[PDB]
Protein backbone atom coordinates (compact mmCIF):
# COMPACT_ATOMS: atom_id res chain seq x y z
CA UNK A 1 0.00 0.00 0.00
CA UNK A 2 1.43 3.54 -0.56
CA UNK A 3 1.18 4.71 3.10
CA UNK A 4 3.02 1.64 4.33
CA UNK A 5 6.00 2.34 2.05
CA UNK A 6 6.07 6.09 2.57
CA UNK A 7 8.44 7.16 5.36
CA UNK A 8 12.10 6.80 6.43
CA UNK A 9 13.87 3.48 6.41
CA UNK A 10 17.49 2.38 7.32
CA UNK A 11 19.37 -0.72 6.36
CA UNK A 12 22.04 -2.75 8.11
CA UNK A 13 24.94 -0.53 6.90
CA UNK A 14 23.37 2.64 8.44
CA UNK A 15 22.23 4.21 5.08
CA UNK A 16 18.98 6.27 5.02
CA UNK A 17 16.18 5.87 2.44
CA UNK A 18 13.31 8.51 2.54
CA UNK A 19 10.51 7.65 0.11
CA UNK A 20 7.05 8.73 -0.87
CA UNK A 21 4.86 6.26 -2.77
CA UNK A 22 2.29 8.03 -5.04
CA UNK A 23 -1.13 6.57 -6.01
CA UNK A 24 0.08 5.95 -9.59
CA UNK A 25 2.83 3.36 -8.52
CA UNK A 26 5.60 5.95 -8.38
CA UNK A 27 8.39 6.16 -5.85
CA UNK A 28 10.44 9.36 -5.35
CA UNK A 29 12.78 10.21 -2.48
CA UNK A 30 16.41 10.53 -1.39
CA UNK A 31 19.01 7.96 -0.42
CA UNK A 32 21.84 8.91 2.02
CA UNK A 33 25.13 7.20 2.73
CA UNK A 34 25.93 5.62 6.09
CA UNK A 35 26.43 8.51 8.54
CA UNK A 36 28.66 11.09 6.70
CA UNK A 37 27.13 14.59 7.08
CA UNK A 38 24.40 16.24 4.95
CA UNK A 39 25.81 16.37 1.38
CA UNK A 40 25.60 12.61 0.99
CA UNK A 41 22.03 12.77 -0.37
CA UNK A 42 21.21 11.38 -3.83
CA UNK A 43 17.89 11.39 -5.77
CA UNK A 44 16.01 8.09 -6.21
CA UNK A 45 13.04 7.15 -8.41
CA UNK A 46 11.30 3.79 -8.63
CA UNK A 47 8.02 2.01 -9.03
CA UNK A 48 5.96 -0.42 -6.92
CA UNK A 49 2.82 -2.53 -7.49
CA UNK A 50 0.03 -0.18 -6.24
CA UNK A 51 -2.45 -3.10 -6.31
CA UNK A 52 -0.64 -6.03 -4.56
CA UNK A 53 -2.34 -9.35 -3.85
CA UNK A 54 -4.72 -10.42 0.00
CA UNK A 55 -2.91 -12.19 1.02
CA UNK A 56 0.21 -12.05 3.20
CA UNK A 57 2.29 -11.57 0.04
CA UNK A 58 4.84 -8.76 -0.23
CA UNK A 59 4.45 -5.78 -2.60
CA UNK A 60 7.09 -5.83 -5.35
CA UNK A 61 9.02 -2.62 -5.98
CA UNK A 62 12.35 -1.32 -7.13
CA UNK A 63 14.27 1.91 -7.42
CA UNK A 64 17.47 3.35 -8.76
CA UNK A 65 20.08 5.86 -7.49
CA UNK A 66 22.82 7.25 -9.89
CA UNK A 67 25.59 8.26 -7.52
CA UNK A 68 26.00 11.78 -8.72
CA UNK A 69 24.84 14.92 -6.91
CA UNK A 70 26.36 18.47 -6.60
CA UNK A 71 29.28 17.29 -4.47
CA UNK A 72 30.31 13.95 -5.86
CA UNK A 73 30.06 11.74 -8.90
CA UNK A 74 31.04 8.10 -8.47
CA UNK A 75 30.09 7.17 -12.14
CA UNK A 76 27.83 4.34 -11.04
CA UNK A 77 24.21 3.51 -10.44
CA UNK A 78 22.52 0.97 -8.19
CA UNK A 79 19.12 -0.53 -8.56
CA UNK A 80 17.35 -2.39 -5.70
CA UNK A 81 14.68 -4.92 -6.55
CA UNK A 82 12.67 -6.42 -3.62
CA UNK A 83 9.43 -6.70 -1.68
CA UNK A 84 7.81 -4.55 1.02
CA UNK A 85 6.32 -6.68 3.81
CA UNK A 86 4.06 -4.61 6.15
CA UNK A 87 2.95 -5.37 9.70
CA UNK A 88 4.01 -3.89 13.04
CA UNK A 89 7.64 -4.43 11.94
CA UNK A 90 7.54 -3.49 8.28
CA UNK A 91 10.59 -4.37 6.19
CA UNK A 92 11.68 -4.00 2.55
CA UNK A 93 13.88 -7.01 1.56
CA UNK A 94 16.05 -6.41 -1.50
CA UNK A 95 18.79 -7.70 -3.82
CA UNK A 96 20.74 -4.93 -5.62
CA UNK A 97 23.07 -4.48 -8.62
CA UNK A 98 25.68 -1.66 -8.57
CA UNK A 99 27.13 -0.96 -12.05
CA UNK A 100 30.08 1.41 -12.56
CA UNK A 101 30.91 3.03 -15.93
CA UNK A 102 33.97 1.13 -17.32
CA UNK A 103 35.91 0.86 -20.54
CA UNK A 104 35.16 -2.04 -22.88
CA UNK A 105 38.02 -3.98 -21.34
CA UNK A 106 36.80 -3.90 -17.67
CA UNK A 107 33.18 -4.28 -18.57
CA UNK A 108 33.40 -7.87 -17.34
CA UNK A 109 33.74 -6.67 -13.68
CA UNK A 110 31.48 -3.64 -13.89
CA UNK A 111 28.69 -5.07 -11.70
CA UNK A 112 28.49 -5.92 -7.96
CA UNK A 113 25.51 -7.77 -6.43
CA UNK A 114 24.44 -7.72 -2.77
CA UNK A 115 21.33 -7.67 -0.57
CA UNK A 116 19.95 -5.15 1.93
CA UNK A 117 17.09 -5.23 4.36
CA UNK A 118 15.46 -1.92 5.34
CA UNK A 119 13.57 -1.29 8.64
CA UNK A 120 11.01 1.52 8.85
CA UNK A 121 11.63 4.29 11.46
CA UNK A 122 9.37 7.25 10.51
CA UNK A 123 6.18 7.71 8.43
CA UNK B 1 23.94 -34.55 -25.96
CA UNK B 2 24.84 -36.16 -22.56
CA UNK B 3 28.64 -36.39 -22.82
CA UNK B 4 28.60 -33.56 -25.32
CA UNK B 5 29.81 -31.35 -22.45
CA UNK B 6 33.20 -33.08 -22.56
CA UNK B 7 35.59 -31.04 -24.65
CA UNK B 8 37.28 -27.67 -24.94
CA UNK B 9 35.10 -24.58 -24.79
CA UNK B 10 36.01 -20.92 -25.16
CA UNK B 11 34.18 -17.87 -23.97
CA UNK B 12 33.91 -14.41 -25.36
CA UNK B 13 36.97 -13.21 -23.28
CA UNK B 14 39.34 -15.86 -24.65
CA UNK B 15 39.47 -18.13 -21.60
CA UNK B 16 39.54 -21.86 -22.28
CA UNK B 17 37.58 -24.41 -20.29
CA UNK B 18 38.46 -28.14 -20.72
CA UNK B 19 36.07 -30.58 -18.96
CA UNK B 20 35.24 -34.23 -18.57
CA UNK B 21 31.66 -35.08 -17.65
CA UNK B 22 31.36 -38.39 -15.71
CA UNK B 23 28.22 -40.49 -16.27
CA UNK B 24 26.98 -39.74 -12.74
CA UNK B 25 27.05 -35.95 -12.71
CA UNK B 26 30.58 -34.91 -12.03
CA UNK B 27 32.42 -32.22 -13.94
CA UNK B 28 36.27 -32.02 -13.60
CA UNK B 29 38.77 -30.05 -15.69
CA UNK B 30 41.08 -27.05 -16.06
CA UNK B 31 40.13 -23.38 -16.61
CA UNK B 32 42.87 -21.26 -18.16
CA UNK B 33 43.09 -17.62 -18.33
CA UNK B 34 44.42 -14.96 -20.67
CA UNK B 35 47.24 -15.52 -23.19
CA UNK B 36 46.96 -19.29 -22.74
CA UNK B 37 50.37 -19.23 -20.99
CA UNK B 38 51.70 -22.04 -18.74
CA UNK B 39 49.92 -21.87 -15.45
CA UNK B 40 47.25 -19.51 -16.19
CA UNK B 41 45.54 -22.87 -15.39
CA UNK B 42 43.32 -23.46 -12.48
CA UNK B 43 41.40 -26.58 -11.44
CA UNK B 44 37.64 -26.59 -11.71
CA UNK B 45 35.10 -29.04 -10.30
CA UNK B 46 31.29 -29.04 -10.73
CA UNK B 47 28.17 -31.04 -11.24
CA UNK B 48 25.51 -31.40 -13.95
CA UNK B 49 22.15 -33.19 -14.50
CA UNK B 50 23.16 -36.66 -15.90
CA UNK B 51 19.48 -37.50 -16.59
CA UNK B 52 18.07 -34.27 -18.12
CA UNK B 53 14.46 -33.99 -19.16
CA UNK B 54 13.40 -35.60 -22.41
CA UNK B 55 11.77 -32.43 -23.66
CA UNK B 56 14.12 -30.09 -25.61
CA UNK B 57 15.37 -28.44 -22.44
CA UNK B 58 19.03 -27.65 -21.82
CA UNK B 59 21.09 -29.55 -19.17
CA UNK B 60 21.66 -27.69 -15.85
CA UNK B 61 25.21 -27.57 -14.56
CA UNK B 62 27.56 -25.47 -12.55
CA UNK B 63 31.18 -25.39 -11.49
CA UNK B 64 33.69 -23.51 -9.37
CA UNK B 65 37.25 -22.26 -9.77
CA UNK B 66 39.21 -20.84 -6.72
CA UNK B 67 41.86 -18.54 -8.23
CA UNK B 68 44.93 -20.04 -6.66
CA UNK B 69 47.48 -22.29 -8.36
CA UNK B 70 51.28 -22.79 -7.72
CA UNK B 71 52.05 -19.43 -9.18
CA UNK B 72 49.24 -17.04 -8.23
CA UNK B 73 46.57 -16.60 -5.55
CA UNK B 74 43.95 -13.89 -6.34
CA UNK B 75 42.05 -14.69 -3.06
CA UNK B 76 38.77 -15.17 -4.85
CA UNK B 77 36.56 -17.86 -6.31
CA UNK B 78 34.04 -17.89 -9.15
CA UNK B 79 31.01 -20.10 -9.61
CA UNK B 80 29.21 -20.40 -13.02
CA UNK B 81 25.64 -21.65 -13.03
CA UNK B 82 23.82 -22.30 -16.35
CA UNK B 83 22.82 -24.86 -18.94
CA UNK B 84 24.21 -26.72 -21.84
CA UNK B 85 22.33 -26.89 -25.16
CA UNK B 86 23.82 -29.28 -27.68
CA UNK B 87 23.32 -29.56 -31.43
CA UNK B 88 25.11 -28.14 -34.41
CA UNK B 89 26.05 -25.08 -32.34
CA UNK B 90 26.54 -26.36 -28.80
CA UNK B 91 26.82 -23.66 -26.15
CA UNK B 92 26.94 -23.38 -22.40
CA UNK B 93 25.10 -20.23 -21.32
CA UNK B 94 26.05 -19.06 -17.78
CA UNK B 95 25.71 -16.31 -15.16
CA UNK B 96 28.56 -16.25 -12.59
CA UNK B 97 29.45 -14.92 -9.15
CA UNK B 98 33.05 -13.94 -8.26
CA UNK B 99 33.55 -13.43 -4.54
CA UNK B 100 36.86 -12.07 -3.19
CA UNK B 101 37.97 -12.75 0.45
CA UNK B 102 37.52 -9.34 2.21
CA UNK B 103 37.45 -7.91 5.71
CA UNK B 104 33.93 -7.30 7.19
CA UNK B 105 34.15 -3.68 6.20
CA UNK B 106 34.37 -4.53 2.50
CA UNK B 107 32.09 -7.52 2.59
CA UNK B 108 29.31 -5.44 1.00
CA UNK B 109 31.22 -5.25 -2.28
CA UNK B 110 32.87 -8.62 -2.27
CA UNK B 111 30.82 -10.11 -5.09
CA UNK B 112 30.70 -9.33 -8.85
CA UNK B 113 28.09 -10.97 -11.13
CA UNK B 114 28.35 -11.41 -14.93
CA UNK B 115 27.39 -13.83 -17.69
CA UNK B 116 29.49 -15.84 -20.21
CA UNK B 117 28.58 -18.01 -23.19
CA UNK B 118 30.98 -20.76 -24.11
CA UNK B 119 31.17 -22.49 -27.54
CA UNK B 120 33.59 -25.10 -28.90
CA UNK B 121 34.85 -22.54 -31.47
Amino acid sequence: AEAGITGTWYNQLGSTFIVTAGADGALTGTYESAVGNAESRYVLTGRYDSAPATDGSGTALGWTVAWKNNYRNAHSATTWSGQYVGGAEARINTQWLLTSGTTEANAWKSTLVGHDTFTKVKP
Amino acid sequence: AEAGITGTWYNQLGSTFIVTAGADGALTGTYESAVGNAESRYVLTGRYDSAPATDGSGTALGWTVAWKNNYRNAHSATTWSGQYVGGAEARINTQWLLTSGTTEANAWKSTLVGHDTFTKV
Binding site: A105, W108, K109 | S33, A34, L98
Partner: peptide
Protein backbone atom coordinates in the same frame (compact mmCIF):
# COMPACT_ATOMS: atom_id res chain seq x y z
CA UNK C 1 42.41 -10.99 -12.29
CA UNK C 2 42.87 -14.36 -14.21
CA UNK C 3 39.13 -14.41 -15.02
CA UNK C 4 39.30 -11.38 -17.21
CA UNK C 5 40.72 -10.76 -20.69
CA UNK C 6 44.49 -10.22 -21.39
CA UNK C 7 46.35 -7.12 -20.28
CA UNK C 8 47.67 -6.53 -23.68
Amino acid sequence: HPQGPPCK
